[PDB]
């Protein structure tokens, strides 16, 4: 049975814990990969965690200088939900230093980019059989979401970036069926910057919130349908979402608000409910520490700084990182709506602490319409390890 279309996002009042890895706490004595950018994707029968490995084990001699991302040794693998990414639990998926993957009900589609900096190549597989390839069109680092793609009515949709990291770039939407590309569209967004988009299905369209690394401290959004016609804009609230960011103030949803801290950013997410918005953001204005979920009842049509409730995930004394959004659909649960969920990455090592490596673990939450609570679920490892001395 294939994931159909037309069902709206479910009504929600809070977020309930779903999973925790405890990966770096176990990698102190066990065999655990050195991973980063872990995302979660669900299909008709199970939910899995995909991650990008550096090709080395934690607490080893080969984990030296693993702060660098592009190398011929990274691979994309996956394991069941809530289980430590061990060599004995993980299933090989693809060869890549940038990747994404979703499901269309029965099977798995994966996209993985590898190659030199100037002529990188993306390989598209469906159930382990290579079905397509795409090549860079601007001669600069070509990269993708690092979170799940959206697959509805047998068609899967992704967005791909190419070009400079501090100027105008160039963007494509890809529409894929059963593993091979059937269409693509060039997004004309003069004055924008889309990177690392998080996408979810709403109504009969796809809704994505992206990252700006050139001159924005709020987040840009794109919306498109199955004919690849797009609307673009910025989140219109005055409660900014990117890190680094300025103090809360006047927002704008026709263009970026710089205020001195636009350059740089982190992967993030927001969920739209009519006129309101749920914004996921870190607690510190300069570093990646803490995490909270803010509910703004006018966040999509008004530029004020006032809100209506805050629930906290990680306190201000602990490290966070990337965050992303996924969905659990009515073919699994059995309802008439899609349950929204999110995940958070937690980074340990360089550049902020005194080690030779860098790794990350994850936690995952799902939205519910009932009583919930706010607490702190940090990483909890005691660094440095044995190899660092």
């Amino acid at each position: 049975v294939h994931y159909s279309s037309g069902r709206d996002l479910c009504p929600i009042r809070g977020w309930a814990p779903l999973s925790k890895d405890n990966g770096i706490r176990i990698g102190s004595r066990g065999e655990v990969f050195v991973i980063r950018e872990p995302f979660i994707s669900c299909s008709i029968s199970e939910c899995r965690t995909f991650f990008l490995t550096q090709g080395a084990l934690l607490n080893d001699k080969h984990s030296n200088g693993t702060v660098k991302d592009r190398s011929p040794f990274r691979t994309l693998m996956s394991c069941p939900i809530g289980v430590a990414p061990s060599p004995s639990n993980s299933r090989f998926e693809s060869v890549a230093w940038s990747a994404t993957a979703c499901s269309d009900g029965p099977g798995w589609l994966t996209l993985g980019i590898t190659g030199p900096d100037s002529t990188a190549v993306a390989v598209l597989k469906y159930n382990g059989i290579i079905t397509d390839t795409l090549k860079s069109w601007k001669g600069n680092i070509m990269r993708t979401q690092e979170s799940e793609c959206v697959c509805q009515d047998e068609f899967c949709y992704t967005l791909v970036t190419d070009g400079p990291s501090d100027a105008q770039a160039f963007y494509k939407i890809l529409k894929i069926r059963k593993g091979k590309i059937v269409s693509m569209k060039d997004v004309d967004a003069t004055g924008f910057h889309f990177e690392e988009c998080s996408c979810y299905p709403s109504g009969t369209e796809i809704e994505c919130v992206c990252r700006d690394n050139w001159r924005g401290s709020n987040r840009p959004w794109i919306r498109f349908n199955s004919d690849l016609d797009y609307q673009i804009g910025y989140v219109c609230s005055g409660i900014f979402g990117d890190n680094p960011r300025p103090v809360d103030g006047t927002g704008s949803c026709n263009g970026p608000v710089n205020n001195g801290k636009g350059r740089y950013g982190v992967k993030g997410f927001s969920f739209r409910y009519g006129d309101g918005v749920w914004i996921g953001r870190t607690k510190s204005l300069e570093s990646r520490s803490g995490f909270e979920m803010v509910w703004d009842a006018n966040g999509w049509v008004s530029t004020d700084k006032d809100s209506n409730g805050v629930q906290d995930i990680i306190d201000n004394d602990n490290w966070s990182g990337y965050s992303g959004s996924f969905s659990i659909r009515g073919e699994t649960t059995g309802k008439n709506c899609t349950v929204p969920c999110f995940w958070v990455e937690m980074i340990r090592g360089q550049p902020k602490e005194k080690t030779i490596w860098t790794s990350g673990s994850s936690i995952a939450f799902c939205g519910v319409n009932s009583d919930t609570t706010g607490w702190s679920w940090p990483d909890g490892a005691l660094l440095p390890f044995d190899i660092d001395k």
Partner: nanobody, 123 residues
Framework: EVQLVESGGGLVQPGGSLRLSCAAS????????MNWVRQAPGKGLEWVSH????????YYADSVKGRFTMSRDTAKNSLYLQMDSLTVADTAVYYC????????????????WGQGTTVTVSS
């Protein structure tokens, strides 16, 4: 065993030309960014030139523009700096240095240097 080795230094009468080479081992030029730096006689360091992993010559120092051409070759992992119209103000020691560009943090810093080669210009 990551390392760099320079070659091509020597003595040149003013107005001449030279061609310096830097040979690398242990890594690839398809992922890293390269630099030519120099130290004059009794003076501090000066940044001369910078090339990018995608092959584009991002920067040339003002004092040495129109006379210097930085280039590379990835099939042999070699870096070249042809220089023309030398002046007595170019006697120096030259190093090739390496650094990186990350797409999440960005531009770490020069952590690998070659042993350097010497060039003199006089009569």
């Amino acid at each position: 065993e990551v390392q760099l080795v320079e070659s091509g230094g020597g003595l040149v009468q003013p107005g001449g030309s030279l061609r310096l080479s830097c040979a690398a081992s242990g890594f690839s030029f398809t992922t890293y960014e390269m630099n030519w730096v120099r130290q004059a006689p009794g003076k501090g360091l000066e940044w001369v030139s910078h090339i990018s992993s995608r092959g584009l010559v991002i920067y040339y120092a003002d004092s040495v523009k129109g006379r210097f051409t930085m280039s590379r070759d990835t099939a042999k992992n070699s870096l070249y700096l042809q220089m023309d119209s030398l002046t007595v103000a170019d006697t120096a020691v030259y190093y090739c240095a390496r650094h990186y560009f990350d797409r999440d943090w960005g531009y770490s810093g020069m952590d690998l240097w070659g042993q350097g080669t010497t060039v003199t210009v006089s009569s």
